[PDB]
Amino acid sequence: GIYQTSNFRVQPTESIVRFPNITNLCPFDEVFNATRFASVYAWNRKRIS
Amino acid sequence: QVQLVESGGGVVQPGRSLRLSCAASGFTLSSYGMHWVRQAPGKGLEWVAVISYDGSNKYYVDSVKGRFTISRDNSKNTLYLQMNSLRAEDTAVYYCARGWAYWELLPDYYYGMDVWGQGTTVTVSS
């Protein structure tokens, strides 16, 4: 006769991840490559977003 | 070219109010500190008032506080010095000067007076 007995599938081997480029970035050069630096008392307070 | 043009000074009867006019060339006054320093022959250099670069803080020497007040309009780049109720001690060669800016971030109690204009004299004459 006939006997439904087994189930088969094909499994993957590798993965791929994608993202929409890196077009916008956080400008941090101005912090390290600053023209002049802030005093001891009081300070520049730069908010990053 | 950086320069300060001063106008409006002249002979003032005591008790009469006069408003100076000054223009700036070569920069934007809204970024720099500005000094009013009168000079009298036979006397020492005298400081009247200053206007902050951002305009937040305005200070006057004890001989001009409340009686002489400074105003700015940066849109047209003009500074008006008010001389209300002139007294005889106000007779001096008044000058306008320019100072440092936010461009070089500097500590409090700012420093200035790197360039100044030709200056205009007011003479409190009877």
Swiss-Prot record, chain A:
Domain of life: Viruses
Record annotation: effect of changing residue 36 to T: In strain: Omicron/BQ.1.1, Omicron/XBB.1.5, Omicron/EG.5.1
Glycosylation sites: 13, 15, 21, 33
Result of changing residue 33 to Q: Reduced viral infectivity
Effect of residue 36 to K: In strain: Mu/B.1.621
Purpose: Attaches the virion to the cell membrane by interacting with host receptor, initiating the infection. The major receptor is host ACE2. When S2/S2' has been cleaved, binding to the receptor triggers direct fusion at the cell membrane. When S2/S2' has not been cleaved, binding to the receptor results in internalization of the virus by endocytosis using host TFRC and GRM2 and leading to fusion of the virion membrane with the host endosomal membrane. Alternatively, may use NRP1/NRP2 and integrin as entry receptors.
Subunit record text: Binds to host ACE2. RBD also interacts with the N-linked glycan on 'Asn-90' of ACE2. Cleavage of S generates a polybasic C-terminal sequence on S1 that binds to host Neuropilin-1 (NRP1) and Neuropilin-2 (NRP2) receptors. Interacts with host integrin alpha-5/beta-1 (ITGA5:ITGB1) and with ACE2 in complex with integrin alpha-5/beta-1 (ITGA5:ITGB1). May interact via cytoplasmic c-terminus with M protein. May interact (via N-terminus) with host bilirubin and biliverdin, thereby preventing antibody binding to the SARS-CoV-2 spike NTD via an allosteric mechanism.
Protein name in the entry: Spike protein S1
